[PDB]
Amino acid sequence: KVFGRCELAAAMKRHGLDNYRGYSLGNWVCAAKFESNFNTQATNRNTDGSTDYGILQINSRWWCNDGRTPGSRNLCNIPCSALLSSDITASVNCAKKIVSDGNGMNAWVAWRNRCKGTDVQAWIRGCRL
Ligand SMILES: [Cl-]
């Protein structure tokens, strides 16, 4: 599924991401935009042979099992294919574990390079939330 900006903001707000560990909704929408272009079906292969999955590009090296990342952890205890669903529940619940692991949203390279220190509330402007 390819989300609209406000559609995704509303879905993330309903799943409890607005101000989760102090990150306003704008931060999550901005990260999703640059990670996946709001496409739940986004996959990208890393140099290490790991693969990034879904709207928040969650990595198979640490977070999910794709059956092809040797020696990897499955710290969200899900198949990576669960992260490609039109329902963002699995992506959001895993993201909550990631952002809680000590480095906050710095875990998302596109958030650090394209969202951090910007006016992120611009991403939820005009939305009915
Ligand atoms: Cl933090």
Curated annotation (Swiss-Prot):
A Pfam family it matches: Lys
GO CC terms in record: cytoplasm; endoplasmic reticulum; extracellular space
PROSITE patterns to which the protein is assigned, alphabetical: GLYCOSYL_HYDROL_F22_1 (PS00128), GLYCOSYL_HYDROL_F22_2 (PS51348)
Annotated S-S bridges: C6-C127, C30-C115, C64-C80, C76-C94
Gene Ontology terms describing biological process: cell wall macromolecule catabolic process; defense response to bacterium; defense response to Gram-negative bacterium; defense response to Gram-positive bacterium; killing of cells of another organism
Broad enzyme group: hydrolase
SMART domains: LYZ1 (SM00263)
Gene3D superfamilies: 1.10.530.10
Keyword terms, alphabetized: Allergen, Antimicrobial, Bacteriolytic enzyme, Disulfide bond, Glycosidase, Hydrolase, Secreted, Signal
Tissue: In the egg white and polymorphonuclear leukocytes.
Active-site residues per Swiss-Prot or TrEMBL entry: E35, D52
Annotated localization: Secreted
Its EC number(s): 3.2.1.17
CDD domains hit by this protein: LYZ_C
GO MF terms, alphabetically ordered: beta-N-acetylglucosaminidase activity; identical protein binding; lysozyme activity
Catalysed transformations (reactions): Hydrolysis of (1->4)-beta-linkages between N-acetylmuramic acid and N-acetyl-D-glucosamine residues in a peptidoglycan and between N-acetyl-D-glucosamine residues in chitodextrins
Alphabetical list of InterPro entries matching this protein: Glyco_hydro_22, Glyco_hydro_22_CS, Glyco_hydro_22_lys, Lysozyme-like_dom_sf
Positions of substrate binding: D101
C-type lysozyme domain residues: 1-129
Known partners and oligomeric status: Monomer.
Note: Lysozyme C is capable of both hydrolysis and transglycosylation; it also shows a slight esterase activity. It acts rapidly on both peptide-substituted and unsubstituted peptidoglycan, and slowly on chitin oligosaccharides.
Stated role: Lysozymes have primarily a bacteriolytic function; those in tissues and body fluids are associated with the monocyte-macrophage system and enhance the activity of immunoagents. Has bacteriolytic activity against M.luteus.
Annotated family: Belongs to the glycosyl hydrolase 22 family.
Name of the molecule in the record: Lysozyme C
